[PDB]
């Protein structure tokens, strides 16, 4: 009813944060490739300096 | 058929049988399929089957 169910945070890190535009078209690249049943078994390749997932 | 009337019948010429009747005014005398009630469950089933098959 009220909680945060959020599994965790995907931390991507580089010399500077992406602009909001860059991040929203990265969200479009993500959802058009990986969401739902249609994307269900694909794996993204990402070449950021470091990638971490924090379990909450 | 094809949204035009191709035949008509009296109560004498055609039976109708219904297992799950309703008093609900808008039910208009029609039945109630368990496929309608369970439809979400059937969809969830179908999706989990597709998910497991899509590994291969």
């Amino acid at each position: 009813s009220h909680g945060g169910t959020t599994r965790g945070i995907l931390q991507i890190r580089s010399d500077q944060q992406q602009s909001q535009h860059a991040l929203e078209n990265f969200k479009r690249e993500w959802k058009s490739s990986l969401s739902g049943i249609n994307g269900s078994w694909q794996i993204p390749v990402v070449m950021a300096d470091d990638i971490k997932f924090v379990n909450m | 058929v094809d949204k035009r009337v191709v035949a008509s019948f009296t109560s004498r010429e055609l039976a109708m049988g219904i297992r799950n009747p309703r008093t609900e005014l808008s039910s208009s005398g029609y039945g109630l399929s368990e496929v309608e009630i369970a439809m979400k469950e059937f969809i969830a089933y179908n999706n989990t089957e597709s998910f497991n098959d899509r590994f291969f």
Side-chain angles (χ1 to χ4, degrees), chain A residues 36-42, chain B residues 47-48 50-52 54-55:
Chain A
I37 290 291
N38 182 58
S40 194
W41 286 92
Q42 300 208 150
Chain B
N47 291 344
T48 310
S50 306
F51 180 81
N52 278 285
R54 280 179 61 120
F55 174 92

Side-chain angles (χ1 to χ4, degrees), chain A residues 2-18:
Chain A
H2 288 67
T5 64
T6 314
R7 293 176 282 179
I9 307 190
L10 176 55
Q11 191 195 359
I12 294 171
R13 196 181 60 170
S14 298
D15 50 37
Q16 184 179 318
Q17 67 176 2
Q18 293 188 104

Side-chain angles (χ1 to χ4, degrees), chain A residues 6-51:
Chain A
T6 314
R7 293 176 282 179
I9 307 190
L10 176 55
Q11 191 195 359
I12 294 171
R13 196 181 60 170
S14 298
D15 50 37
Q16 184 179 318
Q17 67 176 2
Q18 293 188 104
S19 61
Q20 189 64 25
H21 200 315
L23 194 63
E24 284 192 59
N25 72 57
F26 179 90
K27 175 169 176 166
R28 195 185 305 108
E29 291 171 354
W30 189 279
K31 289 199 173 283
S32 65
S33 312
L34 303 170
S35 295
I37 290 291
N38 182 58
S40 194
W41 286 92
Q42 300 208 150
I43 285 163
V45 183
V46 181
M47 302 163 286
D49 304 65
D50 68 85
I51 317 177

